[PDB]
Amino acid sequence: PRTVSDTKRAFYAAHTRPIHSIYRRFIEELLVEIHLLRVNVDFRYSPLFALGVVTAFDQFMEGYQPEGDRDRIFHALCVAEEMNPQQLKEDAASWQQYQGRPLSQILDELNSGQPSAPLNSLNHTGKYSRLHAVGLYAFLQELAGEVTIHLNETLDQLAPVIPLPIEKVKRDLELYRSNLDKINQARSLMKELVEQERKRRAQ
Ligand SMILES: [Hg+2]
């Protein structure tokens, strides 16, 4: 068994540099949430989990500086969680084969009993997480027809063909989009205030 302090020690090991605190509170939450996930007995690694982690990281790290470190933090935190930094980016990028597919055909591939990978991962998720809802959000994003706009209307269509707790998927995605709105509002506040530090020190 491993400990939150041990997993944190692992991140503070490979990442000995400062953590650049605007997105810090999210990194700590992502560190502990993933730890509490994999240490659970029913957790199963899946490309749906991989898509959700990479989607949550890329969108929540909007404008991370310096840019060269955002991929190194991704590299260090993965092994810190005993994950694979390359296997996660491969699984997350593997969903691109569904770009432009209609939602009707996606439902057909699930209803046939033989869904292809990584779409097959919707059944073998294992222990549910908020990150699994984010992975579904990123998958439904790239589909054809702007299926994300009326998200609840889409999730109710998936409910009978998916084993996921749709009502918990609705909630965690609304919590996800509300949090993403706060960081971009804060990141835009940095751009509004970093010019006041750059255009007034040289004024
Ligand atoms: Hg990671």
Numbering used by the authors: 4 to 206
Original paper wording:
Here we show that Psb29 in Synechocystis 6803, like THF1 in Arabidopsis, is important for normal accumulation of the FtsH heterocomplex involved in PSII repair. Each Psb29 subunit consists of 9 alpha helices. A search using PDBeFOLD found no known structures with greater than 70% similarity, indicating that the specific fold is novel.
For preparations in the presence of protease inhibitor, the only crystals obtained were of needle morphology in P6322, which diffracted very weakly. The P6322 form was soaked overnight in 1 mM 4-(Chloromercuri)benzensulfonic acid sodium salt (Jena Bioscience), but this was not used for phase determination. The B-P21,I222 and P6322 crystal forms were solved by molecular replacement with Phaser using the A-P21 structure as a model. A striking feature of Psb29 is the presence of a long alpha helix at the C-terminus extending from the globular protein domain. The first 3 and last 16 residues could not be identified in the most complete crystal structure, possibly because of structural flexibility or because of some proteolytic degradation. In the B-P21 crystal form, the new carboxy terminus at residue Ala189 is clearly visible in the electron density. It is likely that proteolytic cleavage of the C-terminal helix allows more compact higher resolution crystal lattices to form, as there is insufficient space in these lattices to accommodate the C-terminal helix observed in the P6322 crystal form.
